[PDB]
Amino acid sequence: GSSGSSGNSPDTANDGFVRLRGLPFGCSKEEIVQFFSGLEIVPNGMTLPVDFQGRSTGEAFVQFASQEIAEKALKKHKERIGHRYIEIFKSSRAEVRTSGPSSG
Fold this sequence. Notes:
This protein is a component of the heterogeneous nuclear ribonucleoprotein (hnRNP) complexes which provide the substrate for the processing events that pre-mRNAs undergo before becoming functional, translatable mRNAs in the cytoplasm. Binds poly(RG). By secondary structure, this protein is α+β, with helices and mostly antiparallel strands. Helices cover 14% and strands 22% of the residues. The protein has one domain (14-95): Alpha-Beta Plaits.
C-alpha cells in the first residue's frame, strides 16, 4: 500500500533512465530497441553489464529521450521477450555504474 510523491512539476529532472531485470540469453540492443517499439531512445544510451567471464547479468540500463518516454516504457514491466519476463524499474544515469564517482 501507500503511493505518492508530491512535488514533481512538469518537465524537470529525470533523463528517462530505466533498469531491466531478467533479460533473455544473448539479450542485446537489437532485441531491446525493438522491445520498446513506438518509444524513442537516444543513441548509445544503453548499458549491458556482464559477469567476471562476460556472461550477461540479466540486467541492463536504457536511456529514453525524456521522462515522458520513460513512463511509457515503465508500463512494459514484466514484459517477456521470447520466453523470459523482463522487470523494468525506473532508474537514473547516475546509478548506472561506469567506473568513477558517479554513484549514490
